[PDB]
Amino acid sequence: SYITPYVPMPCMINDTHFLLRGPFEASWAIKLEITDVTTLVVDTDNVANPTNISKCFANNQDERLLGFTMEWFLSGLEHDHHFTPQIICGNVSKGEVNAQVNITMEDHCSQVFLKMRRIFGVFKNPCTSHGKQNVLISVSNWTNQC
Ligand SMILES: *[C@@H]1O[C@H](CO)[C@@H](O)[C@H](O)[C@H]1NC(C)=O
Ligand SMILES: *[C@@H]1O[C@H](CO)[C@@H](O)[C@H](O)[C@H]1NC(C)=O
Ligand SMILES: *[C@@H]1O[C@H](CO)[C@@H](O)[C@H](O)[C@H]1NC(C)=O
């Protein structure tokens, strides 16, 4: 099989905060926050799915590398047709997160949790408790957090 060179550096802040440092020691990092706070609402122009979630990083610099990193991150979940979380792109120029991933479904939450547990290791299971659950994806600056 083929080995991608665009593998980020994972680092876990805590049970709900995670970072994927852009490959080749980039000056940026993908920020993943597990939270039940809804920040984004469905709009006629911002709906996305796992197949074109890269379009939530259009106006960003080095958008190619961001797309490659998100591609690495979503391996094994996008190919799944039974993994259909609502994904809402956000206006980064207005201060919104790059993407909001609806993981309210027990199965979607379970899949995201298992992928992130393969990446970062053991942490608190967010799907035990019911209710709304989201993964907010943004791009933050690397300040040598780890
Ligand atoms: C997890 O880390 C973030 C980032 O520093 C912080 O805002 C948040 O309060 C932390 N959560 C807990 C439960 O400590
Ligand atoms: C992703 O593709 C769907 C159709 O498959 C489309 O409706 C949606 O607008 C696309 N996402 C973006 C951000 O353009
Ligand atoms: C997330 O999904 C649930 C059910 O799948 C839905 O009730 C909720 O409205 C969705 N979130 C948003 C912001 O639309």
Residue numbers in the entry: 75 to 220
Question: Could you pull the original sentences from the published paper?
Answer:
The GP1 subunit of the envelope-displayed arenaviral glycoprotein spike complex (GPC) mediates host cell recognition and is an important determinant of cross-species transmission. We solved the crystal structures of the GP1 glycoproteins from Loei River virus (LORV), an Asiatic rodent-borne OW arenavirus of unknown pathogenicity in humans, and Whitewater Arroyo virus (WWAV), an NW arenavirus associated with spillover into human populations in North America. Both WWAV and LORV GP1s were solved at neutral pH (7.5 to 8.0) and acidic pH (5.6 to 5.0), permitting the first direct analysis of the effect of pH on the structure of GP1 in the absence of cognate GP2.
Crystals of WWAV GP1 were generated under two conditions, buffered to pH 7.5 and 5.6, and X-ray diffraction data were collected to 2.4- and 2.0-Å resolution, respectively. As phase determination by molecular replacement with existing arenaviral GP1 structures failed to yield a solution, the single-wavelength anomalous-dispersion (SAD) method was used for structure elucidation. Crystallographic analysis of WWAV GP1 revealed the characteristic α/β fold that has been observed for other NW arenavirus GP1 structures, as well as in OW arenaviral GP1 glycoproteins in GP2-associated states, comprising a seven-stranded β-sheet with three α-helices positioned on the convex side of the molecule. Overlay analysis revealed that while the independently reported WWAV GP1 structures were essentially identical and exhibited an RMSD of 0.9 Å, minor structural differences were observed in loop 5 of the glycoprotein, indicating inherent flexibility in the region or a requirement for the quaternary architecture of the GPC for stabilization. Despite utilizing a common receptor, WWAV exhibits a low level of sequence conservation with other NW arenaviral GP1 glycoproteins with known structures (e.g., 24% and 25% identity to clade B JUNV and MACV, respectively), reflective of its classification as a clade D NW arenavirus. Consistent with a low level of sequence conservation with JUNV and MACV, WWAV GP1 exhibits significant structural variation throughout the α/β fold (2.3- to 2.5-Å RMSD). Comparison of our WWAV GP1 with other NW arenaviral GP1 structures revealed that while the NW arenaviral GP1 scaffold is structurally diverse, especially in loop regions, it adopts a single conformation that is independent of pH or the presence of ligand.
